[PDB]
Amino acid sequence: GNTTSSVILTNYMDTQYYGEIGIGTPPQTFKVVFDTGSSNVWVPSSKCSRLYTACVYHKLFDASDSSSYKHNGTELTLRYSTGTVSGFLSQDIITVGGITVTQMFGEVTEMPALPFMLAEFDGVVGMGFIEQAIGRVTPIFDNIISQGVLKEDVFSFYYNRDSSLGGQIVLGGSDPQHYEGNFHYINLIKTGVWQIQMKGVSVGSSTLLCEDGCLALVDTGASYISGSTSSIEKLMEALGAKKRLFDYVVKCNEGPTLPDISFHLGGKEYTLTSADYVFQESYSSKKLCTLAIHAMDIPPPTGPTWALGATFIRKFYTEFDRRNNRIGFALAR
Ligand SMILES: CCCCNC(=O)[C@H](C)CC(O)[C@@H](N)C[C@H](C)COC(=O)c1cn(Cc2ccccc2)c2ccccc12
């Protein structure tokens, strides 16, 4: 059909990128992460007991103030890699930058403080495929596409390096003010998942890893690059990084020395120098700069998989293509 719209997103410290949807008539503004790993939409419920302190610190959806809410009620539990939330389903109209769509979503009734006491976004909007939607709630993008409004059945991510605009999603296309050189499309390995095949991680000069072909979720709703705790440990052993429990660290003076590491995603040799993966908070002899790669064991479901999160999407503009079932990366301007 023809139209494109775009969601500007705010960037919080290169670790949280969230935009804004409005649910209801009148609209109730919510901050959300637009994440390609999940496929359901949820937001905190006014009904959340505020004995969950993530609920007494976030926007809550009040359906009694919405004229257009159509009550449904089926329980829902989203078990994400990092934490879980449960609640029930509701339906109201959600507005995703310009396009308005009736949508089934979750009003979360239970929301752990860890980690959601530290999340600057209030909800999640999944850009995944229906194969992952808990409870087969038709996901907002298959809904927008039914409007017939978009030019192209695609969406693209720009995640800025921060301090200017924080990032941008374009629904319906991709915006060449933000990428240079031209695209490199890798096809999806099955439909249902923004998943692709990866065959080789190389620390410095020589393939230490995934030499026999691994997978990679390309995950916009993840701050880091991650591999399973084995693949990560040998990468980290090699770099010389230590574990301060949730992350690996390095003595900051070494940071600007750490080898370029490269991802050989189907076709090309996508490659991050040590600016790209190290948070250079300083350049001291001793103090510790965290690295932007985490171990994360994504569960059997999809797989154990490497998740290419926001450390990678900020170096290469990601176009997610549903019409031809493939992902394409090209360089960020
Ligand atoms: C549809 C459910 C079944 C699939 N579930 C999964 O396991 C997938 C892999 C989960 C997945 O996308 C995760 N990678 C992210 C998760 C949805 C997003 O929620 C999060 O836990 C968070 C994600 N962030 C950081 C973040 C925020 C915005 C953009 C990038 C990264 C948080 C910060 C503080 C607190 C919680 C989170």
The values of phi and psi at residue 136, to 5°, are: 50, 30
Is 153 assigned a catalytic role? no
Distance CA 257, CA 273 (A): 9
- Asked if residue 91 lies in contact with residue 105, where contact means CB atoms within 8 angstroms, the answer is yes
Residue 276 CA to ligand 1 centre (angstroms):
21
Q: Solving technique for this entry?
A: X-ray
Can you read off the two tokens belonging to residue 175? 């915006």
By most ligand atoms within 8 Å of CB, the mutation choice from 7, 15, 16 for ligand 1 is: 16
List, in order, residues 6 or more apart from 13 with CB less than 8 Å away: 162
| CA quadruple 285, 287, 292, 297: dihedral, nearest 10 | 120
- Asked if residue 106 lies in contact with residue 133, where contact means CB atoms within 8 angstroms, the answer is no
Please identify which residue in the block is written with the tokens 């229906």. Answer: 130
Stated as kind and residue range, the H or E segment containing 144 is helix 140-146
Residue nearest to atom 5 of ligand 1 (CA): 80
Stated as kind and residue range, the H or E segment containing 104 is strand 99-110
Give the other-Cβ count within 10 Å of 297's Cβ.
14
DSSP string, 192-241: TS-EEEEEEEEETTEEEE-TT-EEEEE-TT-SSEEE-HHHHHHHHHHHT-
- Asked if residue 40 lies in contact with residue 138, where contact means CB atoms within 8 angstroms, the answer is no
Interior angle at CA 154, CA 150 and CA 160, nearest 5: 115
Stated as kind and residue range, the H or E segment containing 313 is helix 310-313
Can you read off the two tokens belonging to residue 139? 């996901």
Domains of the chain: 4-174 (2.40.70.10), 175-332 (2.40.70.10)
Q: Which residues, judged by CB distance below 6 Å to any ligand atom, belong to the binding site of ligand 1?
A: 16-18, 33, 35, 37-40, 78, 80-83, 115-116, 118-119, 121, 124, 126, 132, 134, 219, 221-223, 298, 307, 310
- Asked if residue 278 lies in contact with residue 257, where contact means CB atoms within 8 angstroms, the answer is no
DSSP string, 151-187: SSSEEEEEE-------EEEEESS--TTSEEEEEEEEE
Please identify which residue in the block is written with the tokens 């290419």. Answer: 308
- DSSP conformation class of 34: E
Can you read off the two tokens belonging to residue 148? 């017939």
